[PDB]
Amino acid sequence: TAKKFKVVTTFTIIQDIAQNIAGDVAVVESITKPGAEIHDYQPTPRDIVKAQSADLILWNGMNLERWFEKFFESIKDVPSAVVTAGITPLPIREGPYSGIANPHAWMSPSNALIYIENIRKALVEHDPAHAETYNRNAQAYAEKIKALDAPLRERLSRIPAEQRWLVTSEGAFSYLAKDYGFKEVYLWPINAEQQGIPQQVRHVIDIIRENKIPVVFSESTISDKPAKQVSKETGAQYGGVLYVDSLSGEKGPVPTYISLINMTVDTIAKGFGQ
Ligand SMILES: [Mn+2]
């Protein structure tokens, strides 16, 4: 066991999934730090150094990392793999990114199994000496992720179908909402320039009052102020922060991809009174 195979990912969700597949034969590190906004992140010379010293670079694609392809052109002779191949996208519904793929596919546990398979194939291709370890680790982790779905589905099923309205800041929850039958209301369709402008807030407020939706949420890498503004003006309680674009730090409450799915579903369910 000389030097461990080095994997660099764009952001922390992929880092944790890939580190579960890598086990102890590879070290996986994220370019973005926990808590940092991932869509419009601006890479630094230090990021170039991290990617250039990698043996493999992983990214989401599906229009997530607006920075990645320009960044990756600086990187020489490091292979890359997009980890969303074979996932059927949901289009963004409005705004200047309307009609392109919603990137947040990892929020569907079923989609996470495809992430796992894509990361497995990439590690097996570019570090074939350890293919057996990658294959064994991916099969074990896919088992955990597959088993994850049923208790989450049952928990959210307790909410009456008619009242399944998921009101968030970014429209980052479309894939989770589809899996578990939530209608989707958000202050902005995808992180970009306009985030909490009028017209956005007033539409969401109208939807809330018409349907008496009991809770609204923010997310961990953006400002909670628009969501709190919405809850102040309506009957809706502020449900807290959901996790989608980033894990917490390893010593925080959301250190892993499994903990992120569990925490986000728990917080939603609690916002509805379980
Ligand atoms: Mn996002």
Side-chain angles (χ1 to χ4, degrees), residues 106-123:
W106 61 86
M107 293 304 286
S108 158
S110 297
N111 281 350
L113 299 173
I114 295 177
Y115 276 80
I116 289 160
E117 171 63 7
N118 288 335
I119 295 165
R120 186 201 65 76
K121 291 190 302 180
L123 288 163

PDB file of all heavy atoms in Angstrom, residues 106-123:
ATOM      1  N   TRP A 106     -29.416  14.177  -6.433  1.00  0.00           N
ATOM      2  CA  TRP A 106     -29.035  13.355  -5.288  1.00  0.00           C
ATOM      3  C   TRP A 106     -30.067  13.357  -4.160  1.00  0.00           C
ATOM      4  O   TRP A 106     -29.951  12.529  -3.248  1.00  0.00           O
ATOM      5  CB  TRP A 106     -27.673  13.835  -4.738  1.00  0.00           C
ATOM      6  CG  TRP A 106     -27.679  15.242  -4.261  1.00  0.00           C
ATOM      7  CD1 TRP A 106     -28.034  15.676  -3.011  1.00  0.00           C
ATOM      8  CD2 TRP A 106     -27.307  16.420  -5.004  1.00  0.00           C
ATOM      9  NE1 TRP A 106     -27.913  17.037  -2.932  1.00  0.00           N
ATOM     10  CE2 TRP A 106     -27.472  17.524  -4.137  1.00  0.00           C
ATOM     11  CE3 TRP A 106     -26.866  16.649  -6.316  1.00  0.00           C
ATOM     12  CZ2 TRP A 106     -27.186  18.842  -4.527  1.00  0.00           C
ATOM     13  CZ3 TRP A 106     -26.598  17.964  -6.716  1.00  0.00           C
ATOM     14  CH2 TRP A 106     -26.765  19.047  -5.818  1.00  0.00           C
ATOM     15  N   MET A 107     -31.050  14.267  -4.173  1.00  0.00           N
ATOM     16  CA  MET A 107     -32.022  14.302  -3.084  1.00  0.00           C
ATOM     17  C   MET A 107     -33.073  13.207  -3.203  1.00  0.00           C
ATOM     18  O   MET A 107     -33.936  13.101  -2.321  1.00  0.00           O
ATOM     19  CB  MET A 107     -32.708  15.667  -3.012  1.00  0.00           C
ATOM     20  CG  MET A 107     -31.780  16.792  -2.615  1.00  0.00           C
ATOM     21  SD  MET A 107     -30.930  16.485  -1.038  1.00  0.00           S
ATOM     22  CE  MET A 107     -32.244  16.736   0.144  1.00  0.00           C
ATOM     23  N   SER A 108     -33.034  12.426  -4.277  1.00  0.00           N
ATOM     24  CA  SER A 108     -33.847  11.222  -4.417  1.00  0.00           C
ATOM     25  C   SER A 108     -32.987  10.026  -4.060  1.00  0.00           C
ATOM     26  O   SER A 108     -31.995   9.761  -4.764  1.00  0.00           O
ATOM     27  CB  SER A 108     -34.369  11.082  -5.842  1.00  0.00           C
ATOM     28  OG  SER A 108     -34.703   9.728  -6.118  1.00  0.00           O
ATOM     29  N   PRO A 109     -33.291   9.294  -2.986  1.00  0.00           N
ATOM     30  CA  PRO A 109     -32.473   8.118  -2.665  1.00  0.00           C
ATOM     31  C   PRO A 109     -32.384   7.128  -3.809  1.00  0.00           C
ATOM     32  O   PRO A 109     -31.333   6.497  -3.983  1.00  0.00           O
ATOM     33  CB  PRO A 109     -33.186   7.530  -1.437  1.00  0.00           C
ATOM     34  CG  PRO A 109     -33.809   8.729  -0.782  1.00  0.00           C
ATOM     35  CD  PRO A 109     -34.328   9.531  -1.970  1.00  0.00           C
ATOM     36  N   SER A 110     -33.442   6.987  -4.621  1.00  0.00           N
ATOM     37  CA  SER A 110     -33.337   6.113  -5.785  1.00  0.00           C
ATOM     38  C   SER A 110     -32.256   6.604  -6.741  1.00  0.00           C
ATOM     39  O   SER A 110     -31.500   5.799  -7.294  1.00  0.00           O
ATOM     40  CB  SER A 110     -34.687   6.005  -6.506  1.00  0.00           C
ATOM     41  OG  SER A 110     -35.666   5.398  -5.667  1.00  0.00           O
ATOM     42  N   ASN A 111     -32.180   7.920  -6.963  1.00  0.00           N
ATOM     43  CA  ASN A 111     -31.147   8.469  -7.832  1.00  0.00           C
ATOM     44  C   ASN A 111     -29.751   8.268  -7.249  1.00  0.00           C
ATOM     45  O   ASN A 111     -28.792   8.121  -8.004  1.00  0.00           O
ATOM     46  CB  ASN A 111     -31.412   9.954  -8.089  1.00  0.00           C
ATOM     47  CG  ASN A 111     -32.485  10.173  -9.145  1.00  0.00           C
ATOM     48  OD1 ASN A 111     -32.891   9.226  -9.809  1.00  0.00           O
ATOM     49  ND2 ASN A 111     -32.934  11.418  -9.313  1.00  0.00           N
ATOM     50  N   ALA A 112     -29.622   8.278  -5.918  1.00  0.00           N
ATOM     51  CA  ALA A 112     -28.323   8.067  -5.289  1.00  0.00           C
ATOM     52  C   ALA A 112     -27.731   6.713  -5.653  1.00  0.00           C
ATOM     53  O   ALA A 112     -26.509   6.573  -5.721  1.00  0.00           O
ATOM     54  CB  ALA A 112     -28.455   8.202  -3.776  1.00  0.00           C
ATOM     55  N   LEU A 113     -28.572   5.702  -5.890  1.00  0.00           N
ATOM     56  CA  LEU A 113     -28.037   4.419  -6.328  1.00  0.00           C
ATOM     57  C   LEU A 113     -27.355   4.542  -7.681  1.00  0.00           C
ATOM     58  O   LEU A 113     -26.396   3.821  -7.956  1.00  0.00           O
ATOM     59  CB  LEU A 113     -29.150   3.371  -6.383  1.00  0.00           C
ATOM     60  CG  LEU A 113     -29.867   3.053  -5.076  1.00  0.00           C
ATOM     61  CD1 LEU A 113     -31.047   2.116  -5.341  1.00  0.00           C
ATOM     62  CD2 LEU A 113     -28.915   2.420  -4.070  1.00  0.00           C
ATOM     63  N   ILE A 114     -27.832   5.441  -8.541  1.00  0.00           N
ATOM     64  CA  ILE A 114     -27.168   5.627  -9.827  1.00  0.00           C
ATOM     65  C   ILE A 114     -25.864   6.413  -9.650  1.00  0.00           C
ATOM     66  O   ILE A 114     -24.852   6.096 -10.281  1.00  0.00           O
ATOM     67  CB  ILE A 114     -28.136   6.294 -10.818  1.00  0.00           C
ATOM     68  CG1 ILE A 114     -29.309   5.336 -11.105  1.00  0.00           C
ATOM     69  CG2 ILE A 114     -27.420   6.653 -12.116  1.00  0.00           C
ATOM     70  CD1 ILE A 114     -30.363   5.902 -12.012  1.00  0.00           C
ATOM     71  N   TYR A 115     -25.861   7.425  -8.770  1.00  0.00           N
ATOM     72  CA  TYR A 115     -24.614   8.087  -8.382  1.00  0.00           C
ATOM     73  C   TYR A 115     -23.573   7.064  -7.958  1.00  0.00           C
ATOM     74  O   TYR A 115     -22.411   7.128  -8.371  1.00  0.00           O
ATOM     75  CB  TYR A 115     -24.864   9.062  -7.226  1.00  0.00           C
ATOM     76  CG  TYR A 115     -25.359  10.448  -7.601  1.00  0.00           C
ATOM     77  CD1 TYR A 115     -26.700  10.669  -7.902  1.00  0.00           C
ATOM     78  CD2 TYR A 115     -24.498  11.529  -7.630  1.00  0.00           C
ATOM     79  CE1 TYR A 115     -27.167  11.931  -8.235  1.00  0.00           C
ATOM     80  CE2 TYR A 115     -24.950  12.804  -7.961  1.00  0.00           C
ATOM     81  CZ  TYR A 115     -26.288  12.996  -8.261  1.00  0.00           C
ATOM     82  OH  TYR A 115     -26.746  14.245  -8.600  1.00  0.00           O
ATOM     83  N   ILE A 116     -23.981   6.120  -7.109  1.00  0.00           N
ATOM     84  CA  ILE A 116     -23.050   5.123  -6.586  1.00  0.00           C
ATOM     85  C   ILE A 116     -22.474   4.291  -7.722  1.00  0.00           C
ATOM     86  O   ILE A 116     -21.259   4.057  -7.793  1.00  0.00           O
ATOM     87  CB  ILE A 116     -23.745   4.240  -5.534  1.00  0.00           C
ATOM     88  CG1 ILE A 116     -24.014   5.039  -4.258  1.00  0.00           C
ATOM     89  CG2 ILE A 116     -22.920   2.957  -5.275  1.00  0.00           C
ATOM     90  CD1 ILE A 116     -25.104   4.434  -3.347  1.00  0.00           C
ATOM     91  N   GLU A 117     -23.334   3.843  -8.640  1.00  0.00           N
ATOM     92  CA  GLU A 117     -22.861   3.013  -9.741  1.00  0.00           C
ATOM     93  C   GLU A 117     -21.924   3.783 -10.665  1.00  0.00           C
ATOM     94  O   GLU A 117     -20.941   3.222 -11.168  1.00  0.00           O
ATOM     95  CB  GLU A 117     -24.047   2.458 -10.527  1.00  0.00           C
ATOM     96  CG  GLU A 117     -23.673   1.753 -11.833  1.00  0.00           C
ATOM     97  CD  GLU A 117     -22.821   0.507 -11.629  1.00  0.00           C
ATOM     98  OE1 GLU A 117     -22.610   0.083 -10.471  1.00  0.00           O
ATOM     99  OE2 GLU A 117     -22.354  -0.047 -12.639  1.00  0.00           O
ATOM    100  N   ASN A 118     -22.223   5.060 -10.926  1.00  0.00           N
ATOM    101  CA  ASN A 118     -21.343   5.864 -11.768  1.00  0.00           C
ATOM    102  C   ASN A 118     -19.994   6.101 -11.091  1.00  0.00           C
ATOM    103  O   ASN A 118     -18.946   6.060 -11.749  1.00  0.00           O
ATOM    104  CB  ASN A 118     -22.021   7.192 -12.117  1.00  0.00           C
ATOM    105  CG  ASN A 118     -23.159   7.014 -13.106  1.00  0.00           C
ATOM    106  OD1 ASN A 118     -23.165   6.046 -13.859  1.00  0.00           O
ATOM    107  ND2 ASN A 118     -24.124   7.938 -13.109  1.00  0.00           N
ATOM    108  N   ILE A 119     -19.995   6.351  -9.780  1.00  0.00           N
ATOM    109  CA  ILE A 119     -18.721   6.560  -9.090  1.00  0.00           C
ATOM    110  C   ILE A 119     -17.924   5.261  -9.045  1.00  0.00           C
ATOM    111  O   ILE A 119     -16.698   5.260  -9.212  1.00  0.00           O
ATOM    112  CB  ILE A 119     -18.957   7.146  -7.687  1.00  0.00           C
ATOM    113  CG1 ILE A 119     -19.575   8.542  -7.804  1.00  0.00           C
ATOM    114  CG2 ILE A 119     -17.626   7.226  -6.898  1.00  0.00           C
ATOM    115  CD1 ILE A 119     -20.177   9.075  -6.486  1.00  0.00           C
ATOM    116  N   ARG A 120     -18.613   4.130  -8.851  1.00  0.00           N
ATOM    117  CA  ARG A 120     -17.950   2.828  -8.877  1.00  0.00           C
ATOM    118  C   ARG A 120     -17.252   2.582 -10.212  1.00  0.00           C
ATOM    119  O   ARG A 120     -16.061   2.229 -10.247  1.00  0.00           O
ATOM    120  CB  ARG A 120     -18.970   1.726  -8.586  1.00  0.00           C
ATOM    121  CG  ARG A 120     -18.357   0.340  -8.449  1.00  0.00           C
ATOM    122  CD  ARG A 120     -19.386  -0.763  -8.671  1.00  0.00           C
ATOM    123  NE  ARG A 120     -19.915  -0.771 -10.036  1.00  0.00           N
ATOM    124  CZ  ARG A 120     -19.260  -1.228 -11.101  1.00  0.00           C
ATOM    125  NH1 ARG A 120     -18.035  -1.712 -10.980  1.00  0.00           N
ATOM    126  NH2 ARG A 120     -19.836  -1.206 -12.294  1.00  0.00           N
ATOM    127  N   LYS A 121     -17.981   2.770 -11.325  1.00  0.00           N
ATOM    128  CA  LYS A 121     -17.420   2.516 -12.652  1.00  0.00           C
ATOM    129  C   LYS A 121     -16.212   3.398 -12.924  1.00  0.00           C
ATOM    130  O   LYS A 121     -15.271   2.973 -13.603  1.00  0.00           O
ATOM    131  CB  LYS A 121     -18.470   2.753 -13.742  1.00  0.00           C
ATOM    132  CG  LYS A 121     -19.602   1.750 -13.768  1.00  0.00           C
ATOM    133  CD  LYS A 121     -20.477   1.907 -15.020  1.00  0.00           C
ATOM    134  CE  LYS A 121     -21.079   3.304 -15.131  1.00  0.00           C
ATOM    135  NZ  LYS A 121     -21.930   3.423 -16.357  1.00  0.00           N
ATOM    136  N   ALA A 122     -16.248   4.646 -12.444  1.00  0.00           N
ATOM    137  CA  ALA A 122     -15.138   5.574 -12.652  1.00  0.00           C
ATOM    138  C   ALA A 122     -13.915   5.159 -11.850  1.00  0.00           C
ATOM    139  O   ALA A 122     -12.789   5.197 -12.356  1.00  0.00           O
ATOM    140  CB  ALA A 122     -15.559   6.997 -12.265  1.00  0.00           C
ATOM    141  N   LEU A 123     -14.111   4.795 -10.583  1.00  0.00           N
ATOM    142  CA  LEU A 123     -12.985   4.322  -9.786  1.00  0.00           C
ATOM    143  C   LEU A 123     -12.416   3.027 -10.358  1.00  0.00           C
ATOM    144  O   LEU A 123     -11.195   2.851 -10.430  1.00  0.00           O
ATOM    145  CB  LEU A 123     -13.413   4.126  -8.334  1.00  0.00           C
ATOM    146  CG  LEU A 123     -13.658   5.402  -7.523  1.00  0.00           C
ATOM    147  CD1 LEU A 123     -14.465   5.074  -6.278  1.00  0.00           C
ATOM    148  CD2 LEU A 123     -12.328   6.058  -7.153  1.00  0.00           C
TER     149      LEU A 123
END
